[PDB]
């Protein structure tokens, strides 16, 4: 019951809002983005969490510093929004995968909370 | 180990494994058993000997090396000697 | 557990290493081979304390942590003459010059 | 620019282990080969850090920029191993020459405008002033790679 937000519209990145954000603005290419996020494999039990690390996750949007899925997904989020993403291998680690923690052709699922985004 | 003798200006005799002394280029050339340094005193030449001990020991060490310490009062004369001794 | 030493008498100073497990006797032998005097003609000291031939450098209080290549521990040596042993006497090293002003 | 990070986008888990008595500055050469400072490591400290295959690093004294070693060499470049095991970066002091060590200490004790006021041969004033320098090092290393056909 979720929204495809790929260009090719291959359902390679489905999205569902869970907590609606505030403001009309969204993060743009090159913005410095702040999030919290849980993240886990689809067919899988263990999760990775910024809450554990005790520090928010900070990256530059649109600049290929995270998986293709995140550059796409986060760019649709309003400040304070929480969203679920479900990602096909092509839009993450692909066939190669990333040992130790990402298998080959692994389908990922994330929860993200956009905290803030500022200009370069 | 066979040994060599290094006499400071103030007349202290330092006896050290020859292999260790060869750390100094200047000494290496000078051995072409005993060597007199008329311009290096014992508070300096003693410290040079310690460096040979340090170097010969901790070359080849592959995990962790300690600092070779130098006291402010000797740094400058140790510098002059290191430069003279080529080591 | 290697230990690094200065063996000191009068104006003489020997640099050498040994094991903590090695004995005072073993050390006197090293002395014998350099300064050409037999063990029975030598006495070794740690500060002002005579050291029995059969104790280990270990048991005498020397540790690798306190006898490092860059800061070796000192062992006092004294020789016998005719019927009687000299007292322990180590000539001190020179005293460094005053720290130059720009180094203070 | 010969010495630079490749943009591999292939993550690689590294352990920075500071087995030097210095505070260590890790220096990341970026994609244009231009050095970038990273958070410093206390002596004795170890940390798992995030990096990537083919990313070039070197490590220095955070204060004096004296050069340090990593795995007994000047540069570190993570290669992927199979099964994803971490890559260890073991940071140590080199066995400096006595001369270089003496220069290190005098520099820490004398302000650089005052080297000229030391009573030493001119060559040593020069030597004092020839501070360790990332850019000179990078140039030296560039030529070593090149000359290894």
Curated annotation (Swiss-Prot), chain A:
Alphabetically ordered keywords of this record: Acetylation, Chaperone, Cytoplasm, Isomerase, Nucleus, Phosphoprotein, Repeat, Rotamase, TPR repeat, Ubl conjugation
Disulfide bonds: none
Entry function: Immunophilin protein with PPIase and co-chaperone activities. Component of unligated steroid receptors heterocomplexes through interaction with heat-shock protein 90 (HSP90). Plays a role in the intracellular trafficking of heterooligomeric forms of steroid hormone receptors maintaining the complex into the cytoplasm when unliganded. Acts as a regulator of Akt/AKT1 activity by promoting the interaction between Akt/AKT1 and PHLPP1, thereby enhancing dephosphorylation and subsequent activation of Akt/AKT1.
Full protein segment contained here: 21 to 140 of 457
Domain spans labelled PPIase FKBP-type: 22-110
Induction comment: By androgen.
Complex formation: Part of a heteromultimeric cytoplasmic complex with HSP90AA1, HSPA1A/HSPA1B and steroid receptors. Upon ligand binding dissociates from the complex and FKBP4 takes its place. Interacts with functionally mature heterooligomeric progesterone receptor complexes along with HSP90 and TEBP. Interacts with NR3C1. Interacts with Akt/AKT1 and PHLPP1; enhancing dephosphorylation and subsequent activation of Akt/AKT1. Interacts with IFI44L; this interaction modulates the kinase activity of IKBKB and IKBKE. Interacts with IKBKB and IKBKE.
GO molecular function, one term: heat shock protein binding
Domain of life per record: Eukaryota
N6-acetyllysine: residues bearing it: 8
Subcellular location: Cytoplasm; Nucleus
Curated annotation (Swiss-Prot), chain B:
GO terms under cellular component: Cul2-RING ubiquitin ligase complex; Cul5-RING ubiquitin ligase complex; cytosol; elongin complex; nucleoplasm
Superkingdom per UniProt: Eukaryota
Pathway annotation from the record: Protein modification; protein ubiquitination
Alphabetical list of CDD domains matching this protein: BTB_POZ_EloC (cd18321)
One Pfam short name: Skp1_POZ
Post-translational modification: Ubiquitinated by the DCX(AMBRA1) complex, leading to its degradation by the proteasome.
Location within or outside the cell: Nucleus
Keyword annotations: Host-virus interaction, Nucleus, Transcription, Transcription regulation, Ubl conjugation, Ubl conjugation pathway
Primary localization class, coarse: nucleus
Expression by tissue: Overexpressed in prostate cancer cell line PC-3 and breast cancer cell line SK-BR-3.
InterPro entries xref list: ELC1, SKP1-like, SKP1/BTB/POZ_sf, Skp1_comp_POZ
Keyword Cytoplasm: no
Family membership noted in the UniProt record: Belongs to the SKP1 family.
Protein name: Elongin-C
Gene: ELOC
Curated annotation (Swiss-Prot), chain C:
The encoding gene: ELOB
Keyword field: Acetylation, Host-virus interaction, Nucleus, Phosphoprotein, Transcription, Transcription regulation, Ubl conjugation pathway
Residue numbers carrying N-acetylmethionine: 1
Highest taxon above the source species: Eukaryota
Similarity annotation: Belongs to the Elongin B family.
Single Gene Ontology MF annotation: ubiquitin protein ligase binding
Originating organism: Homo sapiens
UniProt pathway: Protein modification; protein ubiquitination
PROSITE patterns named among the record's database cross-references: UBIQUITIN_2
BP-aspect Gene Ontology terms: positive regulation of proteasomal ubiquitin-dependent protein catabolic process; protein ubiquitination; protein-containing complex assembly; target-directed miRNA degradation; transcription elongation by RNA polymerase II; transcription initiation at RNA polymerase II promoter
GO CC terms, sorted: Cul2-RING ubiquitin ligase complex; Cul5-RING ubiquitin ligase complex; cytosol; elongin complex; nucleoplasm; VCB complex
Domain Ubiquitin-like: from-to ranges: 1-66
Phosphothreonine modification, residue list: 84
Protein localization: Nucleus
Pfam families linked: ubiquitin
Protein name: Elongin-B
Record note on quaternary structure: Heterotrimer of an A (ELOA, ELOA2 or ELOA3P), ELOB and ELOC subunit. The elongin BC complex interacts with EPOP; leading to recruit the elongin BC complex to Polycomb group (PcG) target genes, thereby restricting excessive activity of the PRC2/EED-EZH2 complex.
InterPro entries assigned to the protein according to its UniProt record, in alphabetical order: ELOB, Ubiquitin-like_dom, Ubiquitin-like_domsf
Main location: nucleus
From Swiss-Prot, chain D:
Pathways per UniProt: Protein modification; protein ubiquitination
Keywords linked to the UniProt accession: Cell membrane, Congenital erythrocytosis, Cytoplasm, Disease variant, Endoplasmic reticulum, Membrane, Nucleus, Repeat, Tumor suppressor, Ubl conjugation pathway
Effect of residue 14 to G: In VHLD; type I-II
Consequence of changing residue 24 to L: In VHLD; type II and type 2C
Outcome of mutating residue 28 to S: In VHLD; type I
Tissue specificity note: Expressed in the adult and fetal brain and kidney.
Primary role: Involved in the ubiquitination and subsequent proteasomal degradation via the von Hippel-Lindau ubiquitination complex. Seems to act as a target recruitment subunit in the E3 ubiquitin ligase complex and recruits hydroxylated hypoxia-inducible factor (HIF) under normoxic conditions. Involved in transcriptional repression through interaction with HIF1A, HIF1AN and histone deacetylases. Ubiquitinates, in an oxygen-responsive manner, ADRB2. Acts as a negative regulator of mTORC1 by promoting ubiquitination and degradation of RPTOR.
Protein name (Swiss-Prot/TrEMBL): von Hippel-Lindau disease tumor suppressor
Entire protein: shown range: 61 to 209 of 213
